[PDB]
Amino acid sequence: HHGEASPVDPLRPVVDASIQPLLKEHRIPGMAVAVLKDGKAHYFNYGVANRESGAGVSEQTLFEIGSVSKTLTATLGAYAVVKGAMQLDDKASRHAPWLKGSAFDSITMGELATYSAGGLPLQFPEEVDSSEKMRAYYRQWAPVYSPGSHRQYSNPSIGLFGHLAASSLKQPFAPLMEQTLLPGLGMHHTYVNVPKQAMASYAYGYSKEDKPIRVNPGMLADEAYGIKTSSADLLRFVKANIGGVDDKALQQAISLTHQGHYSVGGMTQGLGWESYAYPVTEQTLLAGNSAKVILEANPTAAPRESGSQVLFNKTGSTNGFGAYVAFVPARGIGIVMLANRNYPIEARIKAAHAILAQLAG
Numbered sequence: 087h088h089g090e091a092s093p094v095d096p097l098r099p100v101v102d103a104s105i106q107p108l109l110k111e112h113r114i115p116g117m118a119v120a121v122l123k124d125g126k127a128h129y130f131n132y133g134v135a136n137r138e139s140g141a142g143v144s145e146q147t148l149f150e151i152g153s154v155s156k157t158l159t160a161t162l163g164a165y166a167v168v169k170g171a172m173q174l175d176d177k178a179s180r181h182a183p184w185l186k187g188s189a190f191d192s193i194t195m196g197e198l199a200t201y202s203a204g205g206l207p208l209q210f211p212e213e214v215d216s217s218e219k220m221r222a223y224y225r226q227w228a229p230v231y232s233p234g235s236h237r238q239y240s241n242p243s244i245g246l247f248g249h250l251a252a253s254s255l256k257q258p259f260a261p262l263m264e265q266t267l268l269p270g271l272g273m274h275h276t277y278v279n280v281p282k283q284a285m286a287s288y289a290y291g292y293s294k295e296d297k298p299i300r301v302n303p304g305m306l307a308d309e310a311y312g313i314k315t316s317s318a319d320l321l322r323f324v325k326a327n328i329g330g331v332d333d334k335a336l337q338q339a340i341s342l343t344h345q346g347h348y349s350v351g352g353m354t355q356g357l358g359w360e361s362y363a364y365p366v367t368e369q370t371l372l373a374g375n376s377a378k379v380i381l382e383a384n385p386t387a388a389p390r391e392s393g394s395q396v397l398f399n400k401t402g403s404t405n406g407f408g409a410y411v412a413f414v415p416a417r418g419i420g421i422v423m424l425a426n427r428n429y430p431i432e433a434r435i436k437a438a439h440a441i442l443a444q445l446a447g
């Protein structure tokens with residue numbers, strides 16, 4: 087393609103330099119990247135969304151974002167707090183009669199949200215595949231740790247937080263998310279359940295064997311990892327987390343998600359979002375997103391003091407997809423990286439850190 091005019095955007099070279107190697111090294115079929123600088127969104131798109139159609143990725147392409155969903159679920163919970171339907175210090179069994187009598191009489195909504203209830207596992211046991219079996223699972227569950235003392239990253243934990251927050255608002259989770267929360271965030275192309283009208287924009291994910299796949303159903307998947315979105319909608323979510331939104335209650339909810347509860351190493355756990363003092367070293371960002379922090383129980387330490395420059399981030403994956411978002415309100419910068427391959431978290435962090443450092447100036 088020589089002889090073509092090169093893109094006009096001054097940020098294109100910076101983003102290409104970090105993203106193109108990544109696509110080639112991990113054989114990523116497609117990636118939508120969106121960056122925020124000086125109030126403005128920039129979109130850089132790579133590759134193909136669906137190898138059957140050959141359609142290129144755009145900033146309207148829908149990707150599974152896996153656990154990045156947890157930031158939206160946390161915002162829904164924070165919205166329930168702002169509306170007075172629940173408090174973070176409520177015992178979880180206050181919001182579910184079927185939980186009365188269990189360990190969840192003495193575990194708070196906040197602890198569920200922040201994976202600190204006492205050792206709920208990363209995933210439901212594969213046998214837990216119905217609502218009835220889910221309820222039984224929680225009632226039988228034996229605490230490993232005292233509430234508040236250890237972070238064990240957990241889909242059953244924040245999934246139950248999101249279930250019960252929706253219940254406190256007297257609406258099922260998915261329609262509450264789609265009809266109240268997402269529209270107020272300006273996310274009009276974001277879904278728990280992708281509707282007919284939007285299916286053509288939905289990428290296929292690609293497994294390590296290059297087979298086309300999409301997310302498998304699971305218990306509390308909607309709450310823990312069930313969002314499909316575009317790079318433009320997720321960057322609008324970043325902007326909502328910096329400059330706010332018109333809905334008064336949703337504004338407060340967003341702010342609540344930034345508040346620190348405790349730290350693990352250099353990472354401070356908020357509601358959904360995980361945060362760092364900024365500027366942040368690649369080493370610190372890698373450690374906070376490392377296998378040790380994701381897969382092991384770590385003791386909770388004092389949260390970082392509030393104020394100064396802070397970076398917020400969240401990783402997420404499904405079998406066919408890999409997502410990352412990071413932003414720094416105090417510098418007005420942010421990045422969204424949505425791919426249809428689940429490629430290593432360390433590579434996401436390296437590229438995002440490098441791009442953000444150039445954007446910061």
Ligand SMILES: *P(=O)(O)OC[C@H]1O[C@@H](n2cnc3c(N)ncnc32)[C@H](O)[C@@H]1O
Nearest residue numbers: 152153209210241304311402403404405
């Ligand atoms: P985040 O992206 O860190 O985690 C959510 C993803 O983990 C996988 N996941 C959760 N629970 C299960 C079960 N029961 N079975 C298979 N995979 C699971 C999904 O890839 C989520 O998107």
